Structures are given as C-alpha cells and as structure tokens.
From a paper:
The tumor suppressor protein p53 triggers transcription-independent apoptosis through direct interactions with BCL-2 family proteins, but the molecular mechanism is not well understood. However, anti-apoptotic BCL-2 proteins antagonize the activity of pro-apoptotic proteins by canonically binding to and sequestering the BH3 domain of pro-apoptotic proteins through a large hydrophobic pocket (called the BH3-binding pocket). In this study, we present three crystal structures of p53-DBD in complex with the anti-apoptotic protein BCL-2 at resolutions of 2.3–2.7 Å. The structures show that two loops of p53-DBD penetrate directly into the BH3-binding pocket of BCL-2.
To improve the success of crystallization and to ensure that the linker does not affect protein interactions, we linked this BCL-2#3 construct to p53-DBD via three different glycine-rich linkers. In particular, crystals of the three BCL-2#3-linker-p53-DBD fusion proteins were successfully optimized for X-ray diffraction, and determined at resolutions of 2.3–2.7 Å in the P 21 21 21 space group. The RMSDs for superposition of these three structures are 0.2–0.5 Å. p53-DBD and BCL-2#3 had similar interaction modes in these three structures, indicating that the linkers did not affect the complex structure. We henceforth used the 22 residue-linked complex structure as a representative structure for the detailed analysis. Two loops of p53, the loop linking strands S5 and S6 (S5-S6 loop) and the large loop L2, insert into the BH3-binding pocket of BCL-2#3 which is composed of BH1-3 domains. The p53-DBD/BCL-2#3 interface covers approximately 1050 Å2 and encompasses a hydrophobic core and surrounding polar interactions. The involved BCL-2 residues are mainly from the α2-α3 and α4-α5 corner regions. Two hydrophobic residues of p53, Leu188 and Leu201, penetrate deeply into the hydrophobic pocket of BCL-2 and interact with BCL-2 residues Phe104, Tyr108, Phe112, Met115 and Leu137. Around the hydrophobic core, Arg107 and Tyr108 of BCL-2 form water-mediated hydrogen bond or direct hydrogen bond contacts with p53 residue Asp186. Asp111, Asn143 and Arg146 of BCL-2 form direct hydrogen bonds with the backbone atoms of residues Leu201, Gly187 and Val203 of p53, respectively.
Numbering used by the authors:
A (entry chain A): 91 to 288
B (entry chain B): 7 to 31, 86 to 203
Write the structure that this text describes.
Amino acid sequence: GSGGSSVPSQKTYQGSYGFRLGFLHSGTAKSVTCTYSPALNKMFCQLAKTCPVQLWVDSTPPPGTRVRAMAIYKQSQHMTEVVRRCPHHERCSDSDGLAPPQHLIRVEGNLRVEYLDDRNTFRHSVVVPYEPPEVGSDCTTIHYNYMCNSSCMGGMNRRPILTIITLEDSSGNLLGRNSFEVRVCACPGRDRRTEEEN
Amino acid sequence: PSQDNREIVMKYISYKLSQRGYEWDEGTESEVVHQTLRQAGDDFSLRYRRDFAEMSSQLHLTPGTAYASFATVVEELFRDGVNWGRIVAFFEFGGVMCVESVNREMSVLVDNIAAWMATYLNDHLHTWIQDNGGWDAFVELYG
Ligand SMILES: [Zn+2]
C-alpha cells in the first residue's frame, strides 16, 4: 500500500548530461546469471546474483551527484502497491551488514551505499554516489542484486516489476531517469529466449 | 570496556598478521564474538577491495601520519550513520593498513594503527554498539 497512492514516474529523461543505460551483451545459454533483452528492454537475473547496469553520460555530472534505484510494479492495477520482499526472504539470514532486510534491490561492492525507507511514500530505494568512469572505460558500472524471485508468493507473486534509475544531485533534485523491466527467475537465459519469441 | 574494546582490536590484528608470516602481539580461538567478526571481515576485504584501496590512497600512510588522518578516513565511512556492516569495514580497513605497512617494511606502524582503531572504537562506536544490542546482537545476525 503506497503512501497516498502517488506512483513515482517512469518517463525517460536523458536531461542535460545525456544520461542513458547500458547492459552487457551476455548471451542466453542457461549458465547465464544476468542478461538483458534489448527488444523487450527487460533484464533477466537470478536471486542475489550480480546484475551489471552501466551509466552512460555525454557530459560528466558534478560531484555530489547520486544514483538511486527503485522498483515499481509494471501493471497499472498494481502500481500503487509498494514492492517489498516476501516475508520468508525478509526473515531469512542474508544480511550484508549494509542493506536492511526488507529492501528488494541492493548494491554490492559499494561501502558508500545508502538505503532509504521513505516517510511519505513508504517506498524502498538504494543510493550510491555517482563516480566518473575509470580510466580505460567510458561508463560507470553499478552491480545490483535482487533479493526475491519474481515468483515468490506473498511478495511479487509473478507480477513483473520495473526498476527506475535516477540521477539526482545533493539536494535530491532530478537530473535524469531511465527504466527497465526485471524478471528474477531460475533460468534467465531460457526465459529470455522463451519470451524473445512469443 | 576501554580495555575490552582494546582487546578485540588487537586480536583482530594479531590474526590478520598471523595469517601471513608475521608474528605480532582458554577457549579463545572459538570465542564466538571475535570468530564471526573475523569471518565477516575476511569476506569484506574481497567485495570491497576497490573501496579499501581508495581509502588507503587517501590515508597516505607514512611514519609521520597522525591519528587525525586515520580518523578522517574512517569518519567518512560512518558519515551516514553507524551499522554493523560499516563497523566490519572499520575493522578490515585497519587490518589491511597493518598488512600494508608490514609489506612496505614499516612494521612499527602496526602499533600506531592498533592504538588508533581502539581510540576511534571507544570514542565513537562503543556507545552505538551498547545501544543496538551489543556484540551479541551482531552475532545474532552474523553481520
Ligand atoms: Zn521472495
């Protein structure tokens, strides 16, 4: 139940910095942990495994810029329900010592990670500081973990979600936004190849 | 309390240095509070190697380094609040600073790093630890 049923927006906004998302061209052989279908703009992944998402930018945002991730349900009849972990996984022992147990999206490999439980919307989000690409690279890579399967009864319950990535400044004002569908499954490569047909 | 916090730091540093060729100083190997902290810190050095490298890049460790520079680096680690994950990162960063100075043939810096960690623990983290269930609450979550 969303606070006041005020769904956060998902409209693409590349903004002043040319903010876009990139994904690894991993295949669909069933030994894939993570792979992105460009035709469906949909990422398929396994629980608690690494999902690299890249941040492409035509002009470097200033320091103090932050990158937020948030999930919402894709179907309109569910957009007002907050995406939470199933009770079983919320109670299980998988704390990384940084992420509260109820959050579904995590960032791994970042000590500066921040988790928010919004006092008005009741929605979860995870925030890290934006950093320019490393030498040799042209994009900034963030490693995400989804901590429930899409099938988990009492959580998502086979409902597709979308992740919304936003560029903010120190004050939280909007600098850019992108989004993609997420299916956390058991066989990501087989499911992408299945849906990428019919 | 102040001595109790000093001990957990030195036992943490003793084990890290002993797990390499460096020797530095009843049922203590199995003591549950320290054992799970060591296992948690061993995990942290792998996943956050990028962050620890950056932190020790900022902490330009030389014989002349004062407490204040160390405190500055670790204070940034807690700027957004204290949690068990960040406290584990506080211990493992001190460990990597100690191994780094032994490897750079500056072994006597290990004493300074050890005293700094105990100081920062007693001054800033101990009140939070006692208010959030003590070390027992840490082992209840195993992190
Ligand atoms: Zn679940």
